[PDB]
Amino acid sequence: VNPTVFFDIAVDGEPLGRVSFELFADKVPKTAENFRALSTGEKGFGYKGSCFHRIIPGFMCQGGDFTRHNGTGGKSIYGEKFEDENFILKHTGPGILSMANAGPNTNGSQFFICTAKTKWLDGKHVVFGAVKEGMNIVEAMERFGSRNGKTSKKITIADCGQLE
Ligand SMILES: [Mg+2]
């Protein structure tokens, strides 16, 4: 069954709300497993405490760089980076969870949550999940972003893990 993960989002250290995702392990097991493990923190490193360093209203919220917190870092549980598992799922609208990357086969730990349909990313970024609960919290997060993605407040993952 597809695992479910949650993020407890905070603004400047204050709780904002919880966001949960369903990970499509049935279609992209390797990619889903990477995100799941990073969320539980079972490997000794992960998303807990990291921030969303790039938030662009009307486009997406990007995070996952738990090593450099600026988009230059992050790593997977399979090594620094791993292959594009497949492009079965498309960016069909708000709530889509997809892997950020630096070109073909450079998936690490960085990911983004779409806040709109972004078809031009199809075939370029691997989609592996979708917001299940808390899409309103994701939209709320946009209020702290900007055209170039720079955030006006510190948006962090105060806590995360696996549900169900
Ligand atoms: Mg992949």
Three-class SS state of 30: helix
Q: Which residues contact 120 (CB under 8 A, 6 or more apart)?
A: none
Obtained via which technique?
Answer: X-ray
Please give the structure tokens belonging to residue 28: 């992209």
Closest by Cα among 100, 114, 108, 84 to 21: 114
Instruction: Report the CATH superfamily, name and number, of domain 1-164.
Output: Cyclophilin-like (2.40.100.10)
Q: What is the resolution of this structure in A?
A: 1.9
What residue segments make up the domains of the chain, in order of their start? 1-164
Please give the structure tokens belonging to residue 27: 């279609």
Distance 33 CA to ligand 1 centre (A): 10
Residue type, 137: I
| Catalytic residue positions, numbered | 54, 59, 62, 101, 112, 121, 125
